[PDB]
Structure formats: C-alpha cells, structure tokens
Coordinates of C-alpha atoms in Angstrom, one line a residue:
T5 CA 90.5 82.3 82.0
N6 CA 87.6 80.4 83.7
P7 CA 87.9 80.1 87.5
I8 CA 88.3 76.6 89.0
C9 CA 86.6 76.4 92.4
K10 CA 88.9 75.1 95.1
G11 CA 89.3 74.5 98.9
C12 CA 85.5 74.9 99.0
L13 CA 82.5 73.4 100.8
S14 CA 79.8 74.7 98.4
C15 CA 80.9 75.2 94.9
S16 CA 78.5 77.1 92.6
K17 CA 78.3 76.9 88.8
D18 CA 78.8 80.5 87.9
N19 CA 79.9 82.3 91.2
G20 CA 82.9 80.3 92.5
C21 CA 82.8 79.3 96.1
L22 CA 79.8 80.1 98.4
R23 CA 81.3 78.6 101.6
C24 CA 85.0 77.9 102.2
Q25 CA 86.6 75.2 104.3
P26 CA 86.8 76.5 107.8
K27 CA 90.5 77.4 107.8
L28 CA 90.6 79.2 104.5
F29 CA 89.9 82.9 104.0
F30 CA 86.9 83.9 101.8
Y31 CA 87.9 86.4 99.1
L32 CA 85.7 88.0 96.5
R33 CA 87.4 88.2 93.1
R34 CA 86.1 89.9 89.8
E35 CA 86.7 88.1 86.5
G36 CA 84.9 89.0 83.3
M37 CA 82.7 91.4 85.3
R38 CA 81.4 88.6 87.5
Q39 CA 82.1 88.1 91.3
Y40 CA 83.6 84.8 92.3
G41 CA 84.1 83.5 95.8
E42 CA 87.6 82.2 96.3
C43 CA 89.2 80.4 99.3
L44 CA 92.7 81.6 100.2
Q45 CA 95.3 80.3 102.6
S46 CA 96.4 83.9 103.2
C47 CA 94.8 87.2 102.2
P48 CA 96.7 89.3 99.5
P49 CA 98.1 92.9 99.9
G50 CA 95.5 95.6 100.3
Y51 CA 93.4 93.2 102.5
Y52 CA 93.6 91.9 106.1
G53 CA 92.4 88.4 107.2
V54 CA 90.0 88.3 110.1
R55 CA 88.0 85.5 111.8
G56 CA 84.4 86.7 111.6
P57 CA 81.6 85.1 113.5
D58 CA 80.4 83.4 110.2
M59 CA 83.8 82.5 108.5
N60 CA 87.4 83.6 108.0
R61 CA 87.5 86.4 105.4
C62 CA 89.7 88.9 103.6
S63 CA 88.4 92.4 104.2
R64 CA 89.6 95.4 102.2
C65 CA 91.9 97.9 104.1
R66 CA 90.0 101.2 103.8
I67 CA 92.1 103.4 106.1
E68 CA 93.2 106.6 104.4
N69 CA 96.9 106.6 103.5
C70 CA 97.3 103.1 105.0
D71 CA 99.5 100.5 103.3
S72 CA 98.7 97.6 105.6
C73 CA 95.8 97.1 108.0
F74 CA 95.7 95.2 111.2
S75 CA 92.0 95.5 111.4
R76 CA 89.2 97.7 110.2
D77 CA 90.2 100.6 112.4
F78 CA 93.9 100.1 112.8
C79 CA 96.7 100.7 110.3
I80 CA 100.0 98.8 110.9
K81 CA 101.9 100.5 108.2
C82 CA 101.2 103.8 106.5
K83 CA 102.1 104.8 102.9
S84 CA 105.2 106.9 102.3
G85 CA 105.4 110.2 104.1
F86 CA 102.9 109.3 106.8
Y87 CA 103.4 108.5 110.5
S88 CA 101.2 105.9 112.3
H89 CA 99.6 107.1 115.5
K90 CA 96.8 105.3 117.3
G91 CA 96.1 103.2 114.2
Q92 CA 95.7 106.2 111.8
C93 CA 98.0 107.9 109.3
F94 CA 99.3 111.5 109.9
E95 CA 101.5 113.9 107.9
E96 CA 102.7 115.4 111.1
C97 CA 102.6 113.9 114.6
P98 CA 100.0 115.7 116.8
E99 CA 100.6 117.9 119.9
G100 CA 102.1 115.8 122.7
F101 CA 103.8 113.3 120.4
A102 CA 107.1 113.2 118.5
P103 CA 108.1 111.6 115.2
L104 CA 110.6 108.7 114.9
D105 CA 111.9 109.0 111.4
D106 CA 113.4 105.5 111.1
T107 CA 110.2 103.6 112.0
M108 CA 107.6 106.3 110.9
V109 CA 105.6 106.2 114.2
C110 CA 104.6 109.0 116.7
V111 CA 105.7 108.5 120.3
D112 CA 105.2 110.3 123.7
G113 CA 106.9 113.8 123.8
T114 CA 106.5 117.1 125.8
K115 CA 103.3 119.2 126.4
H116 CA 105.1 122.3 127.9
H117 CA 105.1 125.5 125.9
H118 CA 107.0 128.7 127.0
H119 CA 105.0 131.8 128.1

C-alpha cells in the first residue's frame, strides 16, 4: 500500500513526513524499499520514545538481550533467562548481588567469602 502522510508539519511527495507536529513521535518506516517518516502517538515495541533537542522520536532499543528499553543505555525488561542489573542484561547476577527469580532483577547481597 501507498503511505498516507499524517499528523505532519512538512509532508513530502515520496518520503512521508519530514517534520511531525510537536507532540508526535517521529518514526522511520520502510515500505517498498523506501524510508518514510511517520508521526506516531506512541512508539511501537522494539523502540523507546524520547524527547530529543530537535523533536520527539522513536529510537531503536539496541541493548543486547533487552526486550524493552528505558533509554539508550538502560534496559527496563530483559529477554527470557536474563536478569536486569544497572540497566544491562545478565545470565547470572554478578558478585555482590543476588537474583530475584520472580521479577528477574539482581539486588544487593553479601561480599563475604570463607577462608
């Protein structure tokens, strides 16, 4: 289908939106091998919304093993089998920290080891 260019301040002929209305989130979509600017009310899964200094945008979550990003560097929810710890995703909680198996986070534990 041919994209209709919506919620937009500058609509182009062949590239969708070039500048969204202030409140909408700019999103770059691929149709028939072309890139189209779209203006979304909320970003879709795999992205996070952020207010940049130029516009609201949907940025791609690139954290390894992350399901949902809070921001570029912080994962809110990791994929299956991973624990979140300081915004990253771990198969095992690191030294000093203990797993909570119902929420899949790492929390403060002991640093003592027997000699």
